[PDB]
Design a protein around this ligand. Structure first.
Ligand SMILES: CCN[C@@](C)(c1ccc(F)cc1)c1cnc(N2CCN(c3ncnn4cc(-c5cnn(C)c5)cc34)CC2)nc1
Length: 297
């Protein structure tokens, strides 16, 4: 075996990213969990030699175990390998010596899309600071372009959902939280023990712990249902129990949201094909949505 796939998480950390810890000033917590949090911060001298830039910083709690610390470094290495794209939350820097790992990313001033949609739900009108159908179509397109970029780098995200899409200036949407993202060299078999986002998962991920380009596409379909339902929770009135799994396996699928264009519901249904081989690729989804936007003009 003289040729092999280069595993981005095995490469050394590139100190071109290194930024002095003592030039980061922490502000409000943006998200938190059992062993970590993300905070807003000011980064003095990060980009502009004399000026401060608002960023986000991901970090573990002091009590975090070694497994969680290695997982944060692995995410930093995946982000370092991926490179830059308009529709992802980009890596800006890292702190690795003098203390625990801090990962510095772009800050998105409007927060996550799910809360944004729920806030805008009452002041939404399909046609024209109100949310409209043109905005929803734009968000669908931008998330599809970000995901096409990830797949073009042979990566899967594994937690695509409206809560992991952020909104920033100019109505630009960015995919965030690469904690579970993987380079898949043709699938990934999760051997972990964590809580899982069951209602966003492809059947083959639930039943066989298998993740692929095609299971990210399933989750994108669920994201589209969240988007055009203005932030409803998927499968309303259905607990995650034995009846849920049985229904999904037999072919049950959600109905169209009221405000989804028929051609966007069509994409949703193909993303949810029981056969992963019949689902569209993100490259095909981008081309589809592009034509819808052009015909909408
Ligand atoms: C599965 C959960 N794991 C953890 C718990 C985790 C943390 C550290 C660890 F070491 C390990 C795990 C986690 C938690 N939270 C995120 N988030 C938060 C949101 N976040 C943002 N990123 C950039 N800008 N930004 C702006 C806003 C915002 C909100 N309101 N407004 C007006 C603006 C929010 C963000 C990215 C992801 N991720 C991970």
């Amino acid at each position: 075996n003289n040729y092999s796939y280069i595993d981005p998480t095995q490469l050394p950390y590139d100190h071109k990213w290194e930024f002095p810890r003592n030039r980061l000033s922490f502000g409000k917590t943006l998200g938190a969990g059992a062993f970590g949090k993300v905070v807003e911060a000011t980064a003095q001298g990060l980009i502009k030699s004399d000026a401060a830039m608002t960023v986000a910083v991901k970090m573990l709690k002091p009590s975090a175990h070694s497994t969680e610390r290695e997982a944060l470094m692995s995410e930093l290495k995946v982000l370092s390998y991926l490179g830059n794209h308009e529709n992802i939350v980009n890596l800006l820097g890292a702190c690795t010596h003098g203390g625990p790992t801090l990962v510095i990313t772009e800050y998105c001033c409007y927060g996550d899309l799910l809360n944004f949609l729920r806030r805008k739900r009452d002041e939404f009108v399909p046609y024209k600071d109100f949310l409209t159908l043109e905005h929803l179509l734009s968000f669908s397109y931008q998330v599809a372009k970000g995901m096409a970029f990830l797949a073009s780098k042979n990566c899967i995200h594994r937690d695509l959902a409206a809560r992991n899409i952020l909104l920033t200036h100019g109505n630009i949407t960015k995919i965030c939280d690469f904690g579970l993202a993987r380079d898949i060299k043709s699938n990934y078999v999760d051997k972990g023990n964590a809580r899982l986002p069951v209602k966003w998962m492809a059947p083959e991920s639930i039943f066989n712990s298998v993740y692929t380009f095609e299971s990210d596409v399933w989750s994108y379909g669920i994201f589209l249902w969240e988007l055009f339902s203005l932030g409803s929770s998927p499968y309303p009135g259905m607990p995650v129990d034995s009846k849920f799994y049985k229904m999904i396996k037999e072919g049950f699928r959600m109905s169209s949201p009221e405000y989804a264009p028929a051609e966007m519901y069509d994409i949703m249904k193909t993303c949810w094909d029981a056969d992963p081989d019949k689902r569209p690729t993100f490259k095909q989804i981008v081309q589809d949505i592009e034509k819808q936007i052009s015909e909408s003009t």
